[PDB]
RNA sequence: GAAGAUGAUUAGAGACCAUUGUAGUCCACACUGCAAACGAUGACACCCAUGAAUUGGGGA
RNA sequence: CAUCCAAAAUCGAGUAACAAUUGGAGGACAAGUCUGGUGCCAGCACCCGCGGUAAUUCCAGCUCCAAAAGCGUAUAUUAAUGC
């Protein structure tokens, strides 16, 4: 792209090589803010983008109306990393362009268990989760290998993303708004690391922040 | 630690953070969940340098449950004084 | 009233897990209560607990490590067999790597993992996570 | 009346036809490998879809169970013949790692390609039917015959053959 | 909500059989008054007797006029109407002719435009109005 | 004060309004059981946090 | 059905005339920024909707799509339905 200038303190560590990874940005939570911190740390020929829908949107006033455009991005690399993005600009390109930005900023790991079969890499969620956005809620079941991606088209897609190849899946309420749908699937493969499973605990150490460590250098960087 | 093979290897991302409060896993996603780290302190005033932490969770700021657990945490340290 | 003792302890568990409390207080004991515990504090759920006696009805304290996620309660204590265990192992639980199922049996209180080893199946009683 | 012979299908039609993304995978095959109609295609995931079937059956299973110790055997010794997996296999998770093109792939048809003896698969079809092909010394004339591991290195042609 | 106890059955049993009633997808299969009320009997086709062309108009939205035709079934004695499903094939039925007629559709609702018609004509005389339509055969005044 | 009567209002008006007026409105003994009979929230039981009051009993 | 066109002796494709059809192409749903004709008429349309002379839907041609020696239509029944 254009010549670009970080103002975050990740930026910085970023575009030198002191954080390398998505992981270290992950593991002591801190936001992303600035899009240019997912291109940097992983490179094209792992991510893909793909638009999930884009569709009008009308706001009224008298006489004529003004119009827009609603549209989602989706975003990832099939090693465990998925974003969903959803923005709204008055043109096609505009809402386009503003998403795949949005939906950089979204990004989330994914954790991947097994169905209680162990081989290979994996090919399975760990546990049953769910996620809610309206009405509609999925419940992503795990399924054995060789099942294939047990879902409409829509969360095929979303699910493809994510790394998962192996699943069975329904949906309840109202699951013809596109939209809701999405963001729903999404909020359900976040849920993996927020449930607490015995395979993880045995007090696991914390270590400094990269931002701490890296501090004289900030401080160099401001100058 | 950790979800492994048959073959023993790591087959993970990461392992997430401990809230050694609640002994939840500390998400990615929560922004809320601080780490707090506090320098000790010798005898004539010096800094052994920052070795304790701790790490509180999103959850415990939404009611702020948060002071309460840190002082349960620091005083069985020996960190805060009790009489 | 409470037609099942089981639904009310295991509900005041599942609410204060849920707060993040580190003890919890039970109203009633019974034989049944006490083995149900024991159970989870082996594989490592639960840190102790005390039984207390007012010489009418004990009350039962809990020390909650926070490593539980839910405490259930299977009400009409439905059958369940050697080939059937597979069945609720799968739909009341989000795994079967780390799901536990816990049964009544003449032999005593145990997992289903122990059931099928000595295989006798029997009447369920609660599942935790 | 008192007819005692069985009648099956072999072969079924996925639902929902119209996907895009299944007809770029259907096409793909018969194109390549030179399959007729999208029928043949159909007909192998029939046998593959029963063949996981009980695979899954029996994973579920504890270990030392009847179910699981013979019937397991059956499965892995079938899919040694006709050399979809190898003899490094035994898991019953191999097994369900079988898709589509590896039955395709060990089809007379393919084989007799592969093996140098036509220039096509679409050429290789015709050898087959026009009687001129053997698979060790029986004279086969279907292309959907599927060829064993050990039969495939002695395919030769036809004594019925002007090419042998 | 539901009841959960051992010997509980009883009034689950009885609950259903009530509350199956409410529901008119079971009614369409078990109750023999829909039966009665259909004109083929539930049969698959009937065969009637032309009576008389009858020009038949259209709603609101959609303006246009439908050509149709007032018949009498053999088998009950009812009078029906049905649609003629070609352009142009008005000319290929006639009064007194033998006519097949059929359900189009969804067979409980009738027809967008055509008010009360849920019946297309399939055959005049045994022959496929479509073989008429795009010609291949010819109809018999025979 | 329904009904009814009379005067207005109005294009039309027992109308809404005004002056009247019967049943009814009250009580006793019989019926009726039809309300937005609503908290549109069935009954019993367990767990569940923040602050300042009120209504009864008891405690220092 | 199979085996064969002599074992001494027995047939035969090149437009390979030995020539594949039935339903579709606005949305749902795979495939037309087409060309002529019709102009709220004729008709299409399970449903949403097309046609008032500027028709991606009608009536024809070409083009392409799905299934294929099978493909449409009707009715019942099951899945879809945690209606």
């Known amino acids: ?223 | ?83 | 009233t409470m037609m099942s003792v089981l639904a009310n302890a295991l509900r005041c568990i599942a609410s204060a897990e849920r707060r993040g409390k580190r003890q919890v207080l039970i109203r009633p004991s019974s034989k049944v209560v006490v083995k149900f515990l024991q159970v989870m504090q082996k594989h490592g759920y639960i840190g102790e607990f005390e039984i207390i006696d007012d010489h009418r009805a004990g009350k039962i304290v809990v020390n909650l490590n926070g490593r539980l996620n839910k405490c259930g309660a299977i009400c009409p204590r439905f059958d369940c067999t050697t080939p059937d265990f597979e069945k609720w192992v799968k739909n009341i639980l989000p795994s079967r790597q780390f799901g536990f199922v816990v049964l009544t049996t003449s032999l005593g209180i145990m997992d289903h993992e122990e059931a099928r080893a000595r295989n006798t199946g029997g009447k369920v009683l609660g599942f935790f996570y | 009346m008192r007819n005692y012979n069985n009648f099956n299908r072999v072969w079924k039609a996925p639902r929902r036809p119209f996907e895009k993304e299944r007809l770029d995978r259907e096409m793909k095959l018969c194109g390549q490998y030179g399959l007729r109609c999208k029928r043949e295609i159909w007909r192998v995931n029939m046998t593959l879809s029963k063949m996981r079937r009980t695979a899954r059956l029996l994973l579920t299973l504890p270990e030392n169970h009847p179910r699981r110790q013979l019937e397991g055997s059956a499965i892995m010794r079938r899919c040694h013949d006709y050399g979809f997996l190898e003899e490094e296999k035994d898991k019953l998770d191999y097994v369900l790692s079988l898709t589509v093109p590896d039955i395709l792939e060990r089809r007379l048809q393919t084989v007799v390609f592969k093996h140098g003896l036509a220039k096509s698969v679409h050429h290789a079809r015709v050898l087959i039917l026009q009687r001129h092909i053997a698979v060790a010394k029986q004279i086969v004339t279907i292309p959907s015959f599927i060829v064993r591991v050990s039969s495939e290195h002695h395919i030769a042609f036809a004594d019925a053959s002007p090419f042998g | ?142």
């Not at chain 1, 103002?7 to 992950?26: N, Y």
């Not at chain 2, 302190?41 to 070795?51: E, F, I, K, R, Y």
């Not at chain 5, 008005?90 to 969804?106: K, M, P, Q, T, Y």
């Open chain 5, 1 to 142: 909500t539901k009841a959960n106890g051992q010997h509980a059955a009883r009034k689950l049993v009885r609950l259903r059989r009530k509350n199956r009633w409410a529901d008119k997808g079971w009614k369409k299969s078990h109750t023999f008054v829909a039966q009665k009320a259909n004109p083929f009997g539930g049969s698959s086709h009937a065969k009637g007797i032309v009576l008389e062309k009858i020009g038949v108009g259209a709603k609101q939205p959609n303006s246009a006029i439908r050509k149709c035709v007032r018949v009498q079934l053999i088998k009950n004695d009812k009078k029906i109407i049905a649609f003629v499903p070609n352009d142009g094939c008005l000319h290929f039925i006639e009064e007194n002719d033998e006519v097949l007629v059929s359900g189009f559709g969804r067979s409980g609702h009738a027809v967008g435009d055509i008010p009360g018609v849920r019946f297309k004509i399939v055959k005049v005389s045994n022959v496929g109005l479509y073989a008429l339509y795009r010609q291949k055969k010819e109809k018999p005044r025979n």
């Open chain 2, 1 to 83: 630690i950790g979800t492994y093979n048959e073959e023993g290897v790591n087959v993970d991302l990461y392992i997430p953070r401990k809230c050694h409060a609640t002994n939840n896993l500390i998400t990615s996603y929560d922004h809320s969940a601080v780490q707090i780290a506090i320098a000790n302190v010798d005898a004539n005033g010096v800094l052994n340098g920052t070795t304790t932490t701790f790490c509180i969770a999103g959850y415990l700021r939404r009611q702020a449950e948060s002071d309460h657990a840190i002082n349960h945490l620091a005083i069985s340290k020996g960190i805060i004084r009790i009489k």
């Open chain 1, 1 to 223: 792209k254009e010549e670009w200038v970080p103002c975050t303190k990740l930026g910085r560590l970023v575009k030198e090589q002191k954080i390398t990874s998505l992981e270290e940005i992950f593991l002591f939570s801190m936001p992303i803010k600035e899009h240019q911190i997912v291109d940097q740390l992983i490179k094209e020929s792992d991510m893909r983008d793909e638009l999930m829908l884009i569709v009008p949107v009308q706001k009224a006033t008298s006489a004529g109306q003004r119009t827009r455009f609603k549209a989602f991005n989706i975003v990832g690399d099939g090693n465990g990393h998925i974003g969903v993005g959803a923005r709204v600009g008055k043109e096609v390109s505009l809402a386009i362009r503003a998403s795949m930005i949005a939906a950089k900023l979204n990004v989330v790991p994914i954790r991947r268990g097994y169905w209680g079969n162990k081989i290979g890499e994996p090919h399975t969620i760990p546990m049953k989760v769910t996620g809610k956005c309206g009405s509609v809620s999925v419940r992503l079941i795990p399924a054995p290998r060789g099942a294939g991606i047990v879902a409409a088209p829509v969360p095929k897609k979303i699910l493809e993303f994510a790394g998962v190849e192996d699943v069975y899946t329904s949906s309840c309420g109202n699951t013809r708004t596109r939209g809701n749908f999405i963001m729903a699937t999404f909020y359900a493969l976040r849920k993996t690391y927020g449930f607490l499973t015995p395979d993880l605990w045995a007090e696991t150490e914390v270590s400094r922040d990269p931002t701490d460590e890296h501090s004289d250098f900030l401080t160099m960087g401001s100058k």
